[PDB]
Amino acid sequence: PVTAGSSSWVDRTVWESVNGTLQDIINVFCSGDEAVTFVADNQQDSDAADVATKLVNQILLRDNPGYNIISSAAQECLVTRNSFIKYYWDEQTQTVKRVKVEYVPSEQIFVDEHATSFADAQYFCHRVRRSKEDLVAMGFPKDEIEATQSTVAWSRTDWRQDIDADIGTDTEDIASMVWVYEHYIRTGVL
């Protein structure tokens, strides 16, 4: 409001349109029981197509919260201008291998100006939150005491949760969360 006397009544127009589009988006994609079903173009590999379809459906819908990921991507992309989904080879250790799919908020994505798509992208950076346990598994085993726009944007997104906040876990704790950087770079390091 400009002044107390005015008592401006904010019109929730963006929210209404966003929800109206998102409901249809979810009704088109997530409504079906199965996400996708690969269809082979030749009868020779028709049998293999069914196995791949079952595997991908189990990995996405059941093995991972596919509905939550899709909803988060839909809601955020419409307002944040872009949403990103990542899939990694999780190797948690009885050592198991999984296809972990997670929604990455646009606040934690960095791309160069000269790139228009992933195919021609020359530099793609991402700040991830990984526990110190993973870091110990790959470097500095003897040292574990290794302690802004994205944070402000995420805080303004909800106003309830502040990403750059002290949860309370002690820093020396082996399970403390730390910010690591993943960089896909097309350069001649050699």
Partner 1 sequence: KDIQDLRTALVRGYIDNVNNANYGRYKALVGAYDRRSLLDNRPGGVVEMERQDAIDLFPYHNLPQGIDGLLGMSEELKETRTGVTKLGMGINPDVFKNDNAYATVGLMMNAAQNRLRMVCRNIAHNGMVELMRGIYNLIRENGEVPIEVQTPRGMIQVNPKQLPARHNLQVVVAISPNEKAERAQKLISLKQLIAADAQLAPLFGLEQDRYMTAQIFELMGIKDTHKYLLPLEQYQPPEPSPMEILQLE
Partner 2 sequence: EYVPSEQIFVDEHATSFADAQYFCHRVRRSKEDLVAMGFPKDEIEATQSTVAWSRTDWRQDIDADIGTDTEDIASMVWVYEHYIRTGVLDKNKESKLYQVIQAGEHILHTEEVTHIPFVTFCPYPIPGSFYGQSVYDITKDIQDLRTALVRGYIDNVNNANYGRYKALVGAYDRRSLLDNRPGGVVEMERQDAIDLFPYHNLPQGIDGLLGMSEELKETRTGVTKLGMGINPDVFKNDNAYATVGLMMNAAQNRLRMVCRNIAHNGMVELMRGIYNLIRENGEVPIEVQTPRGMIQVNPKQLPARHNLQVVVAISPNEKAERAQKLISLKQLIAADAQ
Partner 3 sequence: KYSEEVLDELRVDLQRRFNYAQGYVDMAVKGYAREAWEYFYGNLPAPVTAGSSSWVDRTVWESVNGTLQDIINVFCSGDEAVTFVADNQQDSDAAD
- Cα(68)–Cα(103) distance, integer angstroms: 9
β partners of residue 131: 177
Comparing CB distances to partner 3, the nearer of 19 and 122 is: 19
Which range, of 29-37, 42-50, 112-120, 182-190, touches partner 2 by CB under 8 A?
29-37
Contact 55, 104 (CB under 8 A): no
184 is a contact residue toward partner 1 (CB under 8 A): no
Shortest Cβ distance from residue 171 to partner 3 (Å)?
Answer: 12
22 is a contact residue toward partner 2 (CB under 8 A): yes
* Nearest of 181, 183, 182, 179 to residue 129 by alpha carbon: 179
Shortest Cβ distance from residue 9 to partner 2 (Å)?
Answer: 6
C-alpha distance from residue 169 to each of 129, 131, 174 (Å): 14, 12, 10
Of the CA atoms within 13 Å of residue 159, those in its CB half-sphere come to: 0
Which range, of 35-43, 75-83, 119-127, 180-188, touches partner 2 by CB under 8 A?
75-83
Q: Which does 49 bind (CB under 5 to 8 A by kind): partner 2, partner 3, partner 1, none?
A: partner 1
- What is the residue whose two structure tokens read 């990921």? 69
Query: Residues 36-75 vs partner 1: string with x where CB under 8 A?
Result: xxxxxxx--x--xx-xx--xx--xx------------x--
Question: By CB neighbour count within 10 A (0-12 exposed, 13-18 middle, 19+ buried), where does 60 fall?
Answer: buried
> Contact residues for partner 1 (CB under 8 A)?
5-11, 13-14, 16-17, 20-21, 23-25, 27-29, 31-42, 45, 48-49, 51-52, 55-56, 59-60, 73, 77, 85, 87, 89, 97, 99, 101
